[PDB]
Amino acid sequence: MKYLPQQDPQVFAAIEQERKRQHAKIELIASENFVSRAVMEAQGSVLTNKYAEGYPGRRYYGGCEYVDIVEELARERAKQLFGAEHANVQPHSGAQANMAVYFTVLEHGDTVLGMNLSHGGHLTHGSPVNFSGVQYNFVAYGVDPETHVIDYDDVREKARLHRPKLIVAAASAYPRIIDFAKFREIADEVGAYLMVDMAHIAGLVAAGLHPNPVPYAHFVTTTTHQTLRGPRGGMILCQEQFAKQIDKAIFPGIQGGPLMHVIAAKAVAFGEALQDDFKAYAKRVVDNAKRLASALQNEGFTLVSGGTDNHLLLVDLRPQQLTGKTAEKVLDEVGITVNKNTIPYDPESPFVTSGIRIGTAAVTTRGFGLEEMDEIAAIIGLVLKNVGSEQALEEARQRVAALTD
Amino acid sequence: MKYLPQQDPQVFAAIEQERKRQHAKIELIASENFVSRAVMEAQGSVLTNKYAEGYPGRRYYGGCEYVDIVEELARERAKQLFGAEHANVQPHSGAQANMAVYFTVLEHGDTVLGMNLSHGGHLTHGSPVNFSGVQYNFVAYGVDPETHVIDYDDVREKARLHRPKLIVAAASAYPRIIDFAKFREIADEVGAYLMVDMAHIAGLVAAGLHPNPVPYAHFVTTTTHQTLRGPRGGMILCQEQFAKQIDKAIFPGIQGGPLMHVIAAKAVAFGEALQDDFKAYAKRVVDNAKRLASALQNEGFTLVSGGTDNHLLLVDLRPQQLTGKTAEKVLDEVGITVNKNTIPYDPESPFVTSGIRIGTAAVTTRGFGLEEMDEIAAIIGLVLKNVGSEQALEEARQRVAALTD
Numbered sequence: 001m002k003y004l005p006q007q008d009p010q011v012f013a014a015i016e017q018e019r020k021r022q023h024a025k026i027e028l029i030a031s032e033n034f035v036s037r038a039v040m041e042a043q044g045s046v047l048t049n050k051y052a053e054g055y056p057g058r059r060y061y062g063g064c065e066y067v068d069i070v071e072e073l074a075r076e077r078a079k080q081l082f083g084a085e086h087a088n089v090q091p092h093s094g095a096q097a098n099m100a101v102y103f104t105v106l107e108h109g110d111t112v113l114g115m116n117l118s119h120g121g122h123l124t125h126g127s128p129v130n131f132s133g134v135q136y137n138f139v140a141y142g143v144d145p146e147t148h149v150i151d152y153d154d155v156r157e158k159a160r161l162h163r164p165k166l167i168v169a170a171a172s173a174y175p176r177i178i179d180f181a182k183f184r185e186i187a188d189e190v191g192a193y194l195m196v197d198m199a200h201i202a203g204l205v206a207a208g209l210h211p212n213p214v215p216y217a218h219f220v221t222t223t224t225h226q227t228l229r230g231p232r233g234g235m236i237l238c239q240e241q242f243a244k245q246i247d248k249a250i251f252p253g254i255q256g257g258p259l260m261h262v263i264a265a266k267a268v269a270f271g272e273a274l275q276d277d278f279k280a281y282a283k284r285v286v287d288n289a290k291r292l293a294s295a296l297q298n299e300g301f302t303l304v305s306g307g308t309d310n311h312l313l314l315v316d317l318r319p320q321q322l323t324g325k326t327a328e329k330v331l332d333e334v335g336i337t338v339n340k341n342t343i344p345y346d347p348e349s350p351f352v353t354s355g356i357r358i359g360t361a362a363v364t365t366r367g368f369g370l371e372e373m374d375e376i377a378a379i380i381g382l383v384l385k386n387v388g389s390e391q392a393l394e395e396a397r398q399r400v401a402a403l404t405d
Numbered sequence: 406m407k408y409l410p411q412q413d414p415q416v417f418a419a420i421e422q423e424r425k426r427q428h429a430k431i432e433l434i435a436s437e438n439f440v441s442r443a444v445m446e447a448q449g450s451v452l453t454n455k456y457a458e459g460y461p462g463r464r465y466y467g468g469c470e471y472v473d474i475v476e477e478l479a480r481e482r483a484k485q486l487f488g489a490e491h492a493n494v495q496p497h498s499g500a501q502a503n504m505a506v507y508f509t510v511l512e513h514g515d516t517v518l519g520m521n522l523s524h525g526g527h528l529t530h531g532s533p534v535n536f537s538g539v540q541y542n543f544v545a546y547g548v549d550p551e552t553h554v555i556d557y558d559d560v561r562e563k564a565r566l567h568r569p570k571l572i573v574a575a576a577s578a579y580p581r582i583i584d585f586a587k588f589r590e591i592a593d594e595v596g597a598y599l600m601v602d603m604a605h606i607a608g609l610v611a612a613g614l615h616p617n618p619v620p621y622a623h624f625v626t627t628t629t630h631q632t633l634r635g636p637r638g639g640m641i642l643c644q645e646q647f648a649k650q651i652d653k654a655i656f657p658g659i660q661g662g663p664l665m666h667v668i669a670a671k672a673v674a675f676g677e678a679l680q681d682d683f684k685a686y687a688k689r690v691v692d693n694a695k696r697l698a699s700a701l702q703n704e705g706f707t708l709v710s711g712g713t714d715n716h717l718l719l720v721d722l723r724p725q726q727l728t729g730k731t732a733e734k735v736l737d738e739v740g741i742t743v744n745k746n747t748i749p750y751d752p753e754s755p756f757v758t759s760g761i762r763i764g765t766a767a768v769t770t771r772g773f774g775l776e777e778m779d780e781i782a783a784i785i786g787l788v789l790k791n792v793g794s795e796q797a798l799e800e801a802r803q804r805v806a807a808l809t810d
């Protein structure tokens with residue numbers, strides 16, 4: 001940086017701490033990642049500077065000839081990546097992407113069927129303190145109490161009983177592959193649309209390591225920032241038939257001027273995902289998650305669903321008599337960042353929980369491999385099995401520091 | 406830039422064209438501006454990298470110690486700038502700032518009273534193709550047919566008749582000072598909340614050149630990117646009493662994770678606005694707008710309301726027998742960027758219009774003064790009065806190029 005340090009020492013000092021923190025810690029929050037310098041450079045550009053309500057070639061302001069190229073690069077790279085008939089790269093976030101789809105297909109009060117929020121469903125999938133749950137009537141399907149795998153008979157019984165106008169599939173904390181074909185078969189049975197929110201697994205879908213929802217769903221939403229490793233923002237993919245309605249849901253519907261600088265960063269991240277080394281990266285993410293899962297079970301931990309098929313894992317801490325809140329706090333003391341997270345059928349509230357959610361996308365981006373996963377799991381075992389020992393905590397700290405340099 | 410040019414030549418070529426375009430044209434769109442390099446550097450930072458749902462010291466993820474400092478710098482600088490009891494710097498845009506206030510105070514179907522959309526009201530103030538107009542029952546107040554000044558007797562009669570739960574004041578195309586004291590007096594008469602959307606005039610308010618709505622309104626919303634000259638995004642200001650409800654409206658209400666890099670750029674722009682040279686800049690904006698207005702009337706143009714009290718002006722092109730659409734197209738041919746815009750009581754539709762909206766915030770940022778305003782007005786007179794002359798158009802092009810270098 002050149003002008004920030006001189007103009008605003010306070011903000012520059014805080015940003016520099018954040019940068020150093022990102023390097024010094026072991027980032028295991030399942031939704032995080034580190035973007036490339038090219039992505040950052042696109043979002044730190046003068047494209048911030050342009051008003052561009054509307055779409056490429058159909059704007060409400062003049063002078064959009066060059067931002068139109070950037071937006072079209074994003075939309076066409078997206079379509080090449082996911083094979084969708086249409087993309088909308090304007091959503092300001094994963095939440096706005098979902099909000100726009102809901103605004104397109106639902107009337108206030110309509111019934112929506114989504115994944116139980118304490119079994120893996122996201123906040124934007126029906127939480128009563130979220131617009132989704134306030135504006136519409138959400139009903140949920142759950143996972144089997146023993147396998148922790150989505151119970152497709154339960155999805156079907158709930159659909160047939162509640163007759164939702166829309167079915168939402170996908171999650172923020174589900175460690176197994178989702179069967180989009182079964183979701184579409186149920187939606188068709190009851191005449192409902194199907195929306196797949198692939199925010200956590202988009203990068204895996206792009207690399208062919210997770211079945212692609214595009215051929216089965218009427219709408220696919222996502223964050224551009226988690227496994228896809230793009231800038232923070234959203235995207236909607238959909239069939240050509242809903243293209244105009246989705247575009248209008250975004251603008252003049254729920255947003256105003258798009259963030260063109262961020263849309264340029266989206267295109268840059270989409271370009272990176274189209275390359276072969278991103279496919280090799282994604283494979284390492286999934287390979288790393290399996291390794292980590294296996295290594296954690298070697299330490300004595302129980303994992304929700306018994307392991308993982310993607311980038312994430314959920315540790316059921318009941319066997320160690322720990323709440324997710326306690327485990328997150330003590331891991332934070334040694335430099336390991338995780339989230340507390342409810343487990344299916346959790347006896348504890350969402351603010352306490354009986355589990356921790358972990359993912360490997362961030363550490364894989366920094367170069368960690370199978371040997372690092374073995375060490376991280378050994379570190380977590382030492383800490384969580386010896387919570388009252390300051391000597392264990394200090395050793396863990398030194399082992400974390402050896403990993404991060 | 407260093408990594409973008411090598412990683413993505415396509416996106417870098419388009420961004421570089423956009424940068425050159427920004428320098429070569431005369432930017433008169435009233436909502437645009439150019440941010441500083443320090444603001445851009447903050448948004449091109451690694452803060453993109455952090456999940457930070459929740460608020461400073463009350464986050465749903467660990468490791469937010471340093472982004473909490475950045476967010477608090479933004480909120481405290483905002484409060485120093487505007488004198489508000491609370492600020493929320495998370496809105497992803499002006500639209501989300503308004504959406505969150507509406508989510509806080511209104512139930513679906515509630516009545517809202519806002520400025521007539523063809524008299525200066527914004528799209529997010531009741532358009533029937535916008536969420537505001539789809540979710541709530543908007544009714545409008547207008548400007549006097551001759552002075553084009555808000556008719557406060559009409560605001561009051563509409564309030565008393567329709568009994569709105571909320572009254573919205575402010576606009577996207579109103580060239581005169583708004584009397585927030587009268588709006589608050591009417592809201593109190595009918596027991597309605599008062600929301601002021603100051604997006605276009607925030608920078609003028611900050612510099613003391615426009616009366617501050619903060620002391621009169623329950624809620625104040627704004628874009629951080631127009632006269633305030635910050636990154637693209639929104640902000641809500643409000644009394645302490647609604648603080649918790651507004652925070653919850655934003656998260657877990659209508660958004661998810663905030664853009665922390667953008668919040669850092671907000672703080673940087675707020676720091677710049679707190680300095681004396683920003684006050685001198687704002688004064689030049691208003692001085693420039695008056696000069697430009699006077700110079701355009703010297704050319705024979707009629708201006709809506711007869712001039713301007715802020716950064717913007719509206720030309721009624723009826724006397725020249727031109728639609729805003731035609732004038733915008735021919736100004737675009739010579740390098741001058743404006744927007745077509747309906748005028749109060751316009752006989753033409755919103756897609757054609759009888760006017761052009763112009764503002765001076767962008768050209769003032771690049772250093773233009775009173776002499777430049779005189780030349781721009783002489784250029785617009787030459788073009789709009791000689792629309793079929795290619796010689797006039799070519800001369801205009803050479804005069805624009807002499808201004809932009």
Ligand SMILES: Cc1ncc(COP(=O)(O)O)c(CNCC(=O)O)c1O
Pocket residue numbers: 030031093094095096098122124170171172197198199200223233234456660661662
């Ligand atoms: C499945 C899923 N969908 C939407 C969001 C919201 O995205 P945002 O950009 O934050 O508005 C998320 C968020 N996930 C964050 C996390 O799991 O840590 C999501 O997972």
Ligand SMILES: Cc1ncc(COP(=O)(O)O)c(CNCC(=O)O)c1O
Pocket residue numbers: 051255256257435436498499500501503527529575576577602603604605628638639
């Ligand atoms: C008064 C007013 N309020 C909200 C917006 C929406 O902001 P955004 O960041 O685009 O969602 C605007 C937009 N103005 C743009 C223009 O007038 O050119 C506004 O004016």
